[PDB]
Amino acid sequence: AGITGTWYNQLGSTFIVTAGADGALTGTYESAVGNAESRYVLTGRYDSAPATDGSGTALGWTVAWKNNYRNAHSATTWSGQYVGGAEARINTQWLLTSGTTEANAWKSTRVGHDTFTK
Amino acid sequence: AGITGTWYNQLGSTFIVTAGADGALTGTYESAVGNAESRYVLTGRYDSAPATDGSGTALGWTVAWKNNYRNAHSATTWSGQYVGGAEARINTQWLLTSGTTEANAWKSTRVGHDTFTKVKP
Amino acid sequence: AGITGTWYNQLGSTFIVTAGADGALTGTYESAVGNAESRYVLTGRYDSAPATDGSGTALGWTVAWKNNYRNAHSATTWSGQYVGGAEARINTQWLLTSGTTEANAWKSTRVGHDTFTK
Amino acid sequence: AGITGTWYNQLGSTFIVTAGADGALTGTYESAVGNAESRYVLTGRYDSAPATDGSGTALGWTVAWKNNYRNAHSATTWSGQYVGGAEARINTQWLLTSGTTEANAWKSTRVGHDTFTKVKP
Numbered sequence: 131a132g133i134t135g136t137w138y139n140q141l142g143s144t145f146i147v148t149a150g151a152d153g154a155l156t157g158t159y160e161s162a163v164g165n166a167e168s169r170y171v172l173t174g175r176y177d178s179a180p181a182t183d184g185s186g187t188a189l190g191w192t193v194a195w196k197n198n199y200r201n202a203h204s205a206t207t208w209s210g211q212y213v214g215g216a217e218a219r220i221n222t223q224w225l226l227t228s229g230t231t232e233a234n235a236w237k238s239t240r241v242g243h244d245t246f247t248k
Numbered sequence: 249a250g251i252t253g254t255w256y257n258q259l260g261s262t263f264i265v266t267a268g269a270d271g272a273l274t275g276t277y278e279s280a281v282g283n284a285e286s287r288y289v290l291t292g293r294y295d296s297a298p299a300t301d302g303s304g305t306a307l308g309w310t311v312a313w314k315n316n317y318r319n320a321h322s323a324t325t326w327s328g329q330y331v332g333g334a335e336a337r338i339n340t341q342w343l344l345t346s347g348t349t350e351a352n353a354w355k356s357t358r359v360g361h362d363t364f365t366k367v368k369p
Numbered sequence: 370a371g372i373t374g375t376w377y378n379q380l381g382s383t384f385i386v387t388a389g390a391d392g393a394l395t396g397t398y399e400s401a402v403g404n405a406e407s408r409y410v411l412t413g414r415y416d417s418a419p420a421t422d423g424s425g426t427a428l429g430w431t432v433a434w435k436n437n438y439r440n441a442h443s444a445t446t447w448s449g450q451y452v453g454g455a456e457a458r459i460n461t462q463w464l465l466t467s468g469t470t471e472a473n474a475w476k477s478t479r480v481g482h483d484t485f486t487k
Numbered sequence: 488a489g490i491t492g493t494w495y496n497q498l499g500s501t502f503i504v505t506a507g508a509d510g511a512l513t514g515t516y517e518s519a520v521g522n523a524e525s526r527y528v529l530t531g532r533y534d535s536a537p538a539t540d541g542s543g544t545a546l547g548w549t550v551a552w553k554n555n556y557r558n559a560h561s562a563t564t565w566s567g568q569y570v571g572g573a574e575a576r577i578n579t580q581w582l583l584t585s586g587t588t589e590a591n592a593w594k595s596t597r598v599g600h601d602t603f604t605k606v607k608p
């Protein structure tokens with residue numbers, strides 16, 4: 131409900147997900163940069179019973195960059211927390227791993243942080 | 249994509265996957281360290297159509313540290329590549345984020361790296 | 370000159386550094402959160418001859434959390450780029466490693482991203 | 488703190504340090520991979536007064552990928568702990584950031600992990 135919705139990060143990406151009962155996140159992702167074309171499938175997990183304190187709700191999803199238009203041969207996992215409020219945000223960090231040959235395995239991962247607004 | 253199987257990272261945590269022909273991962277995860285105990289559910293995505301050159305297959309998945317045995321208010325995202333051959337290893341980096349308050353948001357994410365293989369206790 | 374100065378991140382930390390001729394960064398750091406008390410020494414490296422394009426200047430320093438008031442037994446390395454301008458910023462990401470016993474080695478590192486303003 | 492020595496990560500890059508009694512590291516770094524060639528300078532900080540329990544000594548250092556041989560417009564920060572014993576290993580994670588334009592800022596940082604030891608070619 132708080133999490134279930136449609137979001138947007140600073141890069142302009144579109145994040146449409148449904149916060150499951152089981153603690154499942156399901157939806158689609160449309161990236162605004164990189165070799166992304168249109169929506170991609172997306173799946174993750176969230177804390178069904180977050181702290182009662184003020185803590186945010188932890189979560190994280192995974193976009194495998196393959197659909198009918200492009201296959202960038204690589205997945206991104208966003209790990210972060212949701213914070214409800216007057217400024218409902220979803221703050222995260224993410225990991226861009228690329229299939230590569232062991233000789234490039236070292237420069238295989240790209241790292242960063244996306245902040246979503248609703 | 250020998251991906252569907254039972255793997256083991258160096259912490260000896262068990263990871264059990266099944267890769268659908270669509271690009272989805274499902275299954276469980278049982279850590280050997282941390283506020284964990286028993287199986288936690290896992291949901292992921294992976295490249296159903298990987299490059300045919302040498303390139304390894306890419307993948308990712310999440311485990312919300314909550315189940316019937318415990319709730320650690322946190323989640324981990326594994327991101328890396330499945331690399332096949334004689335010994336099959338799936339190489340990843342990970343982000344473990346615990347839910348927190350403003351004052352702590354800053355130190356909410358821990359970062360690490362896990363290597364998984366088909367055998368070892 | 371562009372880099373040499375005194376900065377501030379979103380957490381309120383104070384970053385005072387001098388951009389060396391050699392490509393050396395030197396100065397002090399005063400953190401606003403964690404177990405930091407007062408200034409700590411700091412040392413790093415920067416790109417002496419950055420791209421002529423529009424690219425930012427890459428850099429990165431290291432604060433070892435020990436001074437006369439506290440020793441949090443841990444170092445932080447910030448890796449990022451400087452971007453001059455009307456909104457001169459220094460965007461980075463950092464790694465908080467803690468001395469620990471191999472049994473906690475796994476949860477040894479803490480990750481994040483600081484954005485500095487001048 | 489056997490820290491001052493000659494180490495080697497699994498990529499077989501050479502790292503040469505000297506730890507001052509103040510908490511500073513100095514020396515060079517010679518990668519075996521990437522837009523690197525020859526020695527690049529390195530500046531770091533480390534715990535001069537480490538915990539006496541078991542805890543490993545923490546450390547960090549930076550290498551701006553520029554010298555007389557090449558300029559890759561990027562820098563790497565290694566962060567981790569020196570862990571002594573029979574075989575001495577210094578365990579780190581790293582952030583390699585290349586300078587870029589707005590449109591690319593988003594993919595400027597690569598992340599990885601390196602393990603260093605006193606011997607191996």
Ligand SMILES: O=C(CCCC[C@@H]1SC[C@@H]2NC(=O)N[C@@H]21)Nc1ccc([N+](=O)[O-])cc1
Pocket residue numbers: 139141143161162163164165166195202203204206224226242244593594
């Ligand atoms: O494989 C990629 C696919 C597209 C990347 C989307 C990323 S997910 C993190 C960030 N947040 C967003 O909303 N969008 C970006 N593209 C790609 C891969 C490699 C290179 N490269 O230069 O190596 C360039 C683009």
Ligand SMILES: O=C(CCCC[C@@H]1SC[C@@H]2NC(=O)N[C@@H]21)Nc1ccc([N+](=O)[O-])cc1
Pocket residue numbers: 257259261278279280281282283284313320321322324342344346360362475476
């Ligand atoms: O309760 C959690 C979950 C347990 C973490 C297991 C980690 S997942 C990365 C690595 N790979 C594995 O197979 N096992 C380990 N962790 C947690 C929660 C809060 C805090 N905290 O500091 O507040 C620290 C850790």
Ligand SMILES: O=C(CCCC[C@@H]1SC[C@@H]2NC(=O)N[C@@H]21)Nc1ccc([N+](=O)[O-])cc1
Pocket residue numbers: 354355378380382400401402403404405434441442443445463465481483
């Ligand atoms: O060892 C630490 C020392 C202080 C941390 C300063 C960090 S550097 C990244 C970030 N940017 C800032 O400007 N300040 C913070 N503190 C510490 C260590 C462990 C825990 N812990 O709960 O485990 C709490 C505080």
Ligand SMILES: O=C(CCCC[C@@H]1SC[C@@H]2NC(=O)N[C@@H]21)Nc1ccc([N+](=O)[O-])cc1
Pocket residue numbers: 236237496498500517518519520521522523552559560561563581583585599601
């Ligand atoms: O030119 C650079 C520097 C070479 C990187 C060596 C890395 S440091 C982490 C690891 N540990 C080592 O000992 N060696 C490797 N890299 C660079 C610059 C630009 C891009 N780019 O994609 O634009 C990629 C890599």
